[PDB]
Chains A and B, each alone.
With several copies, the nearest count.
Chain A
Amino acid sequence: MNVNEFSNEFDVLYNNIMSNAAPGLNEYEKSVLLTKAQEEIVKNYFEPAGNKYGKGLDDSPKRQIDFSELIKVGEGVLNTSAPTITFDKRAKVYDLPADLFLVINEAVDTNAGTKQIVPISYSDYTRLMSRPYKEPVKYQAWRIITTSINNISVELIVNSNETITDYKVRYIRRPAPIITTNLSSEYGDVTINGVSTVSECELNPIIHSEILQRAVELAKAAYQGDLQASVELGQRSE
């Protein structure tokens, strides 16, 4: 469904008034709700426990098609410009893509060979670095986030005596907003995520109905204004 449709079946399923004499439910508010609904749907469907089926990103064909339009593969760029301080001696700082939502696969190409990256927790770093060797297994490398400025910077702790040539990142791209109409036409300087023009949905049509239904539920619960409804439908914001 395109933007005009999103507005139209939102009107049908919510019973608003398209006329402006009665303000009804206008396009900026509908765009805001549709946006919030799409981030809610992405967050709830990525985490298996967030939905009703208990199925995450790649736990069924439907879920694989759901995030299909968001999967993006991009390389990390060395952060040698800034001479910051790393928590590991053998850590090369790499900057991640700006439009990053969730990382699902990472790999580093060294002289020894391609090595899959393991995002190592803060506890496991202490646990594995309290041992004699203190290096990853032969076919893996570690990764811990470090000092970041308006981006995400990651320390790549690869085995010593090896150099990093490439660092590929397969991640879920940040969804673009759902904006039904050019906001600058009537709404002076409002934005949704820094955008003001018409923003078609960048997702597969399969979850467009889910997004619309979630937006309608959010609209009804917000217009009701009850605290209880707000708390219950806030539980599905993660």
Chain B
Amino acid sequence: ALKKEQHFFKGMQRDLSVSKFNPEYAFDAQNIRITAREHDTLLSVSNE
């Protein structure tokens, strides 16, 4: 196509206008863990 955009997940953020949201955060997440637990999955979304 024409353009792209990369999204990382440093945390979960809310309360911010959709026009001005930050791609580094997730708007809403259910049963995930972003810290490395039982495996080296830090800064990578992983299960509960």
Touch between chains A and B, by CB atoms below 8 Å: yes
| Residues on the A chain within 8 Å of B29, using CB | none
B18 at the interface (CB under 8 A from A): no
> Nearest chain-A residue to B1 (Cβ)?
A23
Chain A residues within an 8 Å CB radius of B2: 224-225
Chain A nearest Cβ from B3, distance in angstroms: 12
Chain B interface size, as a band, is under 10
Collect the chain B residues with CB atoms within 8 Å of residue A223's CB.
1
A residues 121-164 touching B (CB-CB < 8 Å): none
Query: Could you tell me the dominant secondary structure of chain A's interface residues?
Result: loop
Could you give, for residues 6-26 of chain B, a 1 whenever the CB lies within 8 Å of some chain A CB and a 0 otherwise? 000000000000000000000
Across the interface, name the chain A residue whose C-beta is closest to B2: A225
Measured between beta carbons, the chain B residues less than 8 angstroms from A23 are 1
Say how far A200's CB is from chain B's closest CB, in angstroms.
32
Provide the A14-50 mask, 1 if CB < 8 A to any CB of B, else 0. 0000000011000000000000000000000000000
Min CB gap A103→B, angstroms: 44
Closest to A226 in B: B2
CB distance from A176 to the nearest CB of B (A): 33
The minimal Cβ–Cβ distance linking A208 to chain B, given in whole angstroms, is 28
Report the minimum CB–CB distance from A31 to chain B (whole Å). Answer: 22
**In the complex, per-residue mask of A215-238: 1 if CB is within 8 Å of any chain B CB, else 0:** 000000001110000000000000
User: Nearest chain B CB to A65's CB is how many angstroms away?
Assistant: 38
Interface string of A182-225 (1 = CB under 8 A from B): 00000000000000000000000000000000000000000111
- Closest approach, in angstroms, between the C-beta of A210 and any C-beta of chain B? 26
Neighbouring A residues of B1 by C-beta, 8 Å: 22-23, 223-224
CB distance from B6 to the nearest CB of A (A): 16
Q: Which chain B positions have C-beta within 8 A of A22? A: 1
Q: Within 8 Å CB of A225, what residues of B?
A: 2
CB distance from A221 to the nearest CB of B (A): 13
When C-beta atoms are compared, the residue in chain B nearest to A225 turns out to be B2
Contacts of A224 in B (CB 8 A): 1-2
- The distance from the CB of A29 to the nearest CB of chain B, in whole angstroms, is 16
**How far, in Å, is A220 (CB) from chain B's closest CB?**
11
What are 6 A-B contacts with C-beta separation under 8 Å? A22-B1, A23-B1, A223-B1, A224-B1, A224-B2, A225-B2
The 6 closest A-B pairs by CB, nearest first: A23-B1, A223-B1, A225-B2, A22-B1, A224-B1, A224-B2
